[PDB]
């Protein structure tokens, strides 16, 4: 059971309720790299950029292969580090490495010296059966002997999205965090990231629509980038609702959402509006135990009412991009996918 | 000393800091009627309909001759009532009667069996020198004998607005009530109530602009009608800002102002805005000893920064109507005015 303490008081408050301590890498991109070491060389299976930032468990994060925003440059630094780690720790077969990118800096989060859960997706995505390869390495056949020595970068994007069991446990706050709660995953294949993401999103049973009213209620950190999300939604045809401070931020930028009351503020409030079906999209971000506790009503309603919702700004942007794609437009077989690989 | 108490709490509260008790006619139109009685008959000098509701002292209320909203049927009752009083009281000379109209019902405020401060305005409006006649009547010369027996109804609108000394006493809260504080008055003459109001407004040294951003912050009782007012403002090309509760009501009507913070909510706040000359108009209504003391900065700032502001919704509608008029478009002389009277 992890925790992200924000302040001193927070700390106590934690222990009370409650040991390692790690500085939390706020606003960093999380990445996973799957690889194979045969003692002689390292084979990079895949570099997957997560959509949800570090702090949202990698198992609960949607992710993309190839990276959708990371510079090749910083990806090179990761590949090198993966390499140094592989040789140093004497890996023989699969490994997984998790990093956090912040301010153009690579930070190591952990090393899993075995097959990680990302293995099948990377394999489907790249056409290389890494578990068969790594198993051959284990039994003694080298990467070189098997002919699997060069990293494969596919010509299309593969996006992985997860499914959470929150609807099975209503009393739980359907919020993402450092601890993994998802039961499964799906894969979206597209020409662009928007396209992959849209397939991934639909595949994951998302109720997201291409029109309607969107409710925006974001935390302080999010106040800046929210403006841009709000316009993208505007550009797409949605109308907007916003709670107090979010409305303020949007107002100051020129966006004037319809103001909506928090449960405490009066009626009608969000709960009522959600209950009524006024929304087709909800973007709600939060930060701080207490802040989280209050906003619980939103997610709870959103889930109960089947309204698609994002709890991270990164996810919101990803959702916004997919609005530009059409998941039903084109289909492709795995055989065809793999045949496109040069 | 008069004040309106709203609840049990409030009443002691008063008595504390502090005798007749009278029920307060809320959301009522105040009316003034000047009249002459000689024992034989009653001449109606004029029926004036206040812009500001009962609760804002007549003396500080803007007014209209002829009535701009009241039905003929209701004036008829007041006319009826006045006569009854005159004879009843044995009025010989001038008299004044104040009424309040609630739900199509006429309530009697007071009777002043003497010359009222409205006499000169009525005289000027109607061409009938009420003071001369009444004196004559007082000395023994009947209306009949004077040949002043019919109620004159002007072909033009006559609006009286007042001037308040707030600017000379900064420490004071520039807000209207049951006690009179104005020192003078002005008159506006027009083809329409709007044109008349517009002249009276300009006459009163108002800083009202025909463009800019308006700030709307209104009470509960007003939250409903404010929509129409907001619409007018928008139709006129103003941009709107609203405090929370007001913003909620508008938005719920399709009207999304720019949300703004009270002083206690954040920076920038209203005071700041005002201070920055961000507004050209402010509509601020309040109810309650506290809601009032809490809004004080709005009015003080507004007065101090020379921004035109109205403290009644009625006053705000009038201001709006006047936006459709040109005070400097047409001029007329008292002589012509009177010449127009048949
Ligand atoms: N220092 C950190 N800064 C930001 N996020 C972190 C940090 N440490 C861990 N996390 C978050 O916690 C998650 C799980 O931590 P990790 O060490 O990988 O635990 P696990 O063994 O459960 O897989 C990560 O996937 C990440 O999103
Ligand atoms: N019962 C009432 N309901 C509403 N407003 C009232 C009532 N009584 C007085 N007022 C308001 O207070 C003002 C002053 O009361 P009034 O008896 O006329 O006082 P004054 O002697 O100063 O002229 C009125 O002009 C009116 O707007
Ligand atoms: N990849 C996690 C699922 C995202 C979920 N809609 C949310 O953002 O909370
Ligand atoms: N006739 C009263 C003065 C009007 C002023 N703008 C107010 O509404 O406070
Ligand atoms: Cl794993
Ligand atoms: Cl449950
Ligand atoms: Cl008087
Ligand atoms: Cl003073
Ligand atoms: K993550
Ligand atoms: K692990
Ligand atoms: K009045
Ligand atoms: K009096
Ligand atoms: Mn991990
Ligand atoms: Mn009076």
From Swiss-Prot, chains A, B:
Any one of the GO BP annotations: pyrimidine nucleobase biosynthetic process
Binding-site residues for Mg(2+) 3, renumbered to this chain: 98, 110
Chain sites annotated for binding Mn(2+) 3: 98, 110
GO MF annotations, alphabetized: amino acid binding; ATP binding; carbamoyl-phosphate synthase (ammonia) activity; carbamoyl-phosphate synthase (glutamine-hydrolyzing) activity; metal ion binding; nucleotide binding
Binding site for ATP 2: 23, 25, 30, 55-58, 98, 110
ATP-grasp domain: residues covered: 1-139
Ranges for domain MGS-like: 206-342
Binding site for Mn(2+) 4: 110, 112
Keywords: Amino-acid biosynthesis, Arginine biosynthesis, ATP-binding, Ligase, Magnesium, Manganese, Metal-binding, Nucleotide-binding, Pyrimidine biosynthesis, Repeat
Entry binding sites for Mg(2+) 4: 110, 112
Start and end residues of each stretch annotated as Allosteric domain: 206-342
GO annotation, cellular component aspect: carbamoyl-phosphate synthase complex; cytoplasm; cytosol
Protein family according to the UniProt entry: Belongs to the CarB family.
Described function: Large subunit of the glutamine-dependent carbamoyl phosphate synthetase (CPSase). CPSase catalyzes the formation of carbamoyl phosphate from the ammonia moiety of glutamine, carbonate, and phosphate donated by ATP, constituting the first step of 2 biosynthetic pathways, one leading to arginine and/or urea and the other to pyrimidine nucleotides.
Subunit note: Composed of two chains; the small (or glutamine) chain promotes the hydrolysis of glutamine to ammonia, which is used by the large (or ammonia) chain to synthesize carbamoyl phosphate. Tetramer of heterodimers (alpha,beta)4.
Comment text on domains: The large subunit is composed of 2 ATP-grasp domains that are involved in binding the 2 ATP molecules needed for carbamoyl phosphate synthesis. The N-terminal ATP-grasp domain (referred to as the carboxyphosphate synthetic component) catalyzes the ATP-dependent phosphorylation of hydrogencarbonate to carboxyphosphate and the subsequent nucleophilic attack by ammonia to form a carbamate intermediate.
Name under which the protein is recorded: Carbamoyl phosphate synthase large chain
Organism, scientific name: Escherichia coli (strain K12)
UniProt gene name: carB
Full protein segment contained here: 724 to 1073 of 1073
């Amino acid at each position: 059971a992890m925790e992200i303490v924000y302040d001193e008081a927070d700390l106590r408050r934690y222990f009370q309720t409650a040991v390692l301590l790690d500085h939390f890498l706020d606003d960093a991109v999380e990445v996973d790299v799957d690889a194979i070491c045969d003692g002689e060389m390292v084979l990079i299976g895949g570099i997957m950029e997560h959509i949800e930032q570090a702090g949202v468990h990698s198992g609960d994060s949607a992710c993309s292969l190839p990276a959708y925003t990371l510079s090749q440059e910083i990806q090179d630094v990761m590949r090198q580090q993966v390499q140094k780690l592989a040789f140093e720790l004497q890996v023989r077969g699969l490994m997984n490495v998790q990093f956090a990118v912040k301010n153009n800096e690579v930070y190591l989060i952990e090393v899993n010296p075995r097959a990680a859960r990302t293995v099948p997706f990377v394999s489907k995505a790249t056409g290389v059966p890494l578990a068969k390869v790594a198993a051959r390495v284990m039994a003694g056949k080298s990467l070189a002997e098997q002919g699997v020595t060069k990293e494969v970068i596919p010509p299309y994007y593969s996006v992985k999205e997860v499914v959470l069991p929150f609807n099975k446990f209503p009393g739980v706050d359907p919020l993402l965090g450092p601890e993994m709660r998802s039961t499964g995953e799906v894969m979206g294949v597209g020409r662009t990231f928007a396209e992959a993401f849209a397939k991934a999103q639909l595949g994951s049973n998302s109720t997201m629509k291409k029109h309607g009213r969107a409710l925006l209620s974001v935390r302080e950190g999010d106040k800046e980038r929210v403006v841009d999300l709000a316009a993208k939604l505007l550009k797409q045809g949605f109308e907007l609702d916003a709670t107090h401070g979010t409305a303020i931020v949007l107002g100051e930028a020129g966006i004037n959402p319809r103001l909506v009351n928090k449960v405490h503020e009066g009626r009608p409030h969000i709960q009522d509006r959600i209950k009524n079906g006024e929304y087709t999209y909800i973007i709600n971000t939060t930060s701080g135990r207490r802040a989280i506790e209050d906003s619980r009503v939103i997610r709870r309603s959103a889930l109960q009412y089947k309204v698609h919702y994002d709890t991270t700004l990164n996810g919101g942007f990803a959702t916004a991009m997919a609005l530009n794609a059409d998941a039903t437009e084109k289909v492709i077989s795995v055989q065809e996918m793999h045949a496109q690989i040069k």
